């Protein structure tokens, strides 16, 4: 009978004051939280942030909403959330978040006979994640979502992960183009500001980069360009136009690779290991072109020595480049 | 007791005229400001602005909200902020700002028995910072945030920094990849417009650009090509093929470098320091080629004077280039 339910609901909201928290002036109200991750869209090094879509559920108790005579959970229209008290929960490290609103505002209010309120939202949030790129491409990142009460201190509100470590679900079926989620972690603490101590929850992920993306995008092209640069040592030094064109083309294409990689990462003043590797590849192609110039200069005097320089280079360049790659890859160990 | 507190708050808001400021028609009301900086997300030279996230707290006294008998500071739900008078504070140089609204509008209202109101907001603002890049990439910037009353003159409202120099915190949290905060400064003043005099607070930051090998690698190609152009002076006139090859190589490489740097440097359509440096290098290689042409012209008439001209150029060109570099690095540093 909907008439009885309407009478009950109208009675509950009769004289209800939304400006006062449950048990105002007494012990803190305890809010339990669940998160169901639906996706982690775009981890960005350039912007130092990531996007996250989730179902965010909050659980508290308000004795002003206890009802009797109806043995049911009352799922109410979500606009009822505007007539009740809700926690002022927010994400400290976010930059732009919204609550989905098609076809209606993605919100859920469910009441239970003992006064317990379940309040659910569907949120897409972009959250900051500062990254350490000194070990690119073998770097490992740690990205967090920080959850805090904006206005109420620990004397008025309390947070806990509802369900222990089983509070956050859906993490194990997240696929990223470049990373893999090695681990996630749940933490609870108190954080002190000039206005007092506030409860805090933290959900952290550890991301590990897949080297298959750095390869096939930056490494394989560099190796191919260096091989093409070496090719010129097998042509007679009479063919000046061919060798000059080959050297210039290799230099310009290696410069393109360097600039492209530098643009895919944020601009920082210092020099990383990967920058050293790309500079080494550039040095190798430029040294091949310069060796041709040196052979051409010395050809007028001792053509036999001019040919011997090419013969020696045919062996020296591949060997030294292989040793350089080995040294670079053993730097990371 | 929640009912007693509800009736007290109802009495507070009973007959409360929100349209009138505190002490309307009398002395001005003093509002103290606090800012806690979360981050400075980005600093754009092309758009000439920077993005700032902050907790902005305002402190004032309203005698209409004084209450007695409750020895507590009442933290009210942020929706109550719509039933209270708040200052019409605005930022003069902001271009696009918003208050974060997940999961609720990040707003805080705290009352004290004396009638004192604390009002806190979490705000992201894209503030305009007109930059002088005539010394790029070794420029120093000064980016400000201006805080002002819009509708109330100094006969109605007063502004001050609460705590003095300790009114702004979190400058250590600012982590710009490309800049480094040198200093921050707090200013209080009055600004006169055609409608009267208004209070003004001003928070300014001094920024220094970080210099690295990547800043260094913009001058090195030009310097190397200039030295290559010098090299031609040591070649005998009989081997003019080498001299002309050096001339054409240097001129083409220099022009290509200049056009590429125009393409890659940030699109700022006025003269900077590096533009003049590149122009000077181009002038030097052009002068070297012109000197070769003059020597080739006078060769058949004054071979001894031609050799003397080459020998004197061998010293003059590096000397004048060192002089040009010295003048440049003393004027722009």
């Amino acid at each position, epitope marked *: 009978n909907m008439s009885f339910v309407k009478e009950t609901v109208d009675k509950l909201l009769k004289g209800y004051d939304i400006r006062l928290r449950p048990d105002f002036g007494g012990p803190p109200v305890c809010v339990g939280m669940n998160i169901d991750i639906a996706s982690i869209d775009m981890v960005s090094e350039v912007n130092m942030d990531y996007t996250l879509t989730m179902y965010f559920q909050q659980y508290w108790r308000d004795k002003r909403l206890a009802y009797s005579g109806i043995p049911l959970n009352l799922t109410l229209d979500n606009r009822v959330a505007d007539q009740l008290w809700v926690p002022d929960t927010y994400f400290l490290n976010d930059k732009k978040s919204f609550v989905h609103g098609v076809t209606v505002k993605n919100r859920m209010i469910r009441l239970h006979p003992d006064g317990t309120v379940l309040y659910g939202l569907r949120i897409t949030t972009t959250a900051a994640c500062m990254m350490d790129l000194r070990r690119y491409p073998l770097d490992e990142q740690n990205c967090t979502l920080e959850i805090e009460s904006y206005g109420y201190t620990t004397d008025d509100i309390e947070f806990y992960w509802r369900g222990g470590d089983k509070a956050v679900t859906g993490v194990e079926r997240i696929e990223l183009p470049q990373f893999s989620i090695v681990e996630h972690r749940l933490v609870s603490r108190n954080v002190v500001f000039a206005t007092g101590a*506030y409860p805090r929850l933290s959900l952290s992920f550890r991301l590990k980069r897949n080297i298959g993306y750095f390869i096939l995008q930056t490494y394989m092209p560099s190796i191919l360009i260096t091989i093409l640069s070496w090719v010129s040592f097998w042509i007679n030094y009479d063919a000046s136009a061919a060798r000059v064109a080959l050297g210039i083309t290799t230099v310009l294409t290696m410069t393109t690779i360097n600039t492209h990689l530098r643009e895919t990462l944020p601009k920082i003043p210092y020099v990383k290991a990967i920058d050293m590797y790309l500079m080494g590849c550039f040095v190798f192609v430029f040294l091949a072109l310069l060796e041709y110039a040196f052979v051409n200069y010395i050809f007028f005097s001792q053509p036999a020595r001019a040919a011997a320089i090419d013969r020696w280079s045919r062996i020296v360049f591949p060997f030294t480049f292989s040793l350089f790659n080995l040294v670079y890859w053993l730097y990371y160990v | 007791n929640m009912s007693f507190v509800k009736e007290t708050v109802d009495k507070l808001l009973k007959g409360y005229d929100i349209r009138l400021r505190p002490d309307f028609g009398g002395p001005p009301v003093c509002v103290g400001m606090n800012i806690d900086i979360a981050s400075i997300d980005m600093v754009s030279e092309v758009n000439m602005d920077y993005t700032l996230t902050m907790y902005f707290q305002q402190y004032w006294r309203d005698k209409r909200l004084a209450y007695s008998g409750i020895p507590l500071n009442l933290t009210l739900d942020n929706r109550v902020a719509d039933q209270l008078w708040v200052p019409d504070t605005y930022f003069l140089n902001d271009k696009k700002s918003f208050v974060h609204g997940v999961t609720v509008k990040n707003r805080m209202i705290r009352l004290h028995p004396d009638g004192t109101v604390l009002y806190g907001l979490r705000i992201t603002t894209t503030a305009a910072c007109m930059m002088d890049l005539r010394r790029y990439p070794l420029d120093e910037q000064n980016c400000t945030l201006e805080i002002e009353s819009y509708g109330y003159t100094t006969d109605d409202i007063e502004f001050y920094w609460r705590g003095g120099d300790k009114a702004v915190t979190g400058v*250590e*949290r600012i*982590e710009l990849p490309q800049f*480094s*905060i040198v200093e921050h400064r707090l200013v209080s003043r009055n600004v006169v417009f055609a409608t009267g005099a208004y209070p003004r607070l001003s928070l300014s930051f001094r920024l220094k650009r970080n210099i690295g090998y990547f800043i260094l690698q913009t001058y090195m190609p030009s310097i190397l090509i200039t030295i290559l152009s010098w090299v031609s002076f040591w070649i005998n006139y009989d081997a003019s093929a080498a001299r002309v090859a050096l001339g054409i190589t240097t001129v083409l490489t220099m022009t290509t470098i200049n056009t590429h740097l125009r393409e890659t440097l940030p699109k700022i359509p006025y003269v900077k320091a590096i533009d003049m440096y590149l122009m000077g290098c181009f002038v030097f290689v052009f002068l070297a080629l012109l000197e070769y042409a003059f020597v080739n012209y006078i060769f058949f008439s004054q071979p001894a004077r031609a050799a003397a001209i080459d020998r004197w150029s061998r010293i003059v060109f590096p000397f004048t280039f060192s002089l040009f570099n010295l003048v440049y690095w003393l004027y722009y540093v």
Partner: nanobody, 105 residues
Framework: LRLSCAASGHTFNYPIMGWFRQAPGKEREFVGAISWSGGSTSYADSVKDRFTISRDNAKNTVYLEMNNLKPEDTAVYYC??????????????????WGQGTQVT
């Protein structure tokens, strides 16, 4: 008198090192704090313009240089690390990893 605090490990997650001193009959008191990267510094009023804080990443170490010592400085000194989103800078509770008590007279 110069104090050294050498921090090793995941120092990127904890970008701020702070210094505290505890009196024999009082609680821990903030002295100063330095950012790992920018070197930005903050000091207490009682120690401002007397103490200085510096750091170097060559061995991941921070330094507190004490000048114009007073009998009021007799306290056991600690060095602590603070996370990126841990709130206020002047509160010992926000600091996760703590050093070893050093006696200064």
């Amino acid at each position: 008198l110069r104090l050294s605090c050498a921090a090793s490990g995941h120092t990127f997650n904890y970008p701020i090192m702070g210094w505290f001193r505890q009196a024999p009959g009082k609680e821990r008191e903030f002295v100063g704090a330095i950012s790992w990267s920018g070197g930005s510094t903050s000091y207490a009023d009682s120690v401002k313009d007397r103490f200085t804080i510096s750091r170097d990443n060559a061995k991941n170490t921070v330094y507190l240089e004490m000048n114009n010592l007073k009998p009021e400085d007799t306290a056991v000194y600690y060095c602590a690390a603070k996370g990126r989103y841990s709130g206020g800078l002047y509160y010992p509770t926000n600091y996760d990893y703590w050093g070893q008590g050093t006696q200064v007279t």
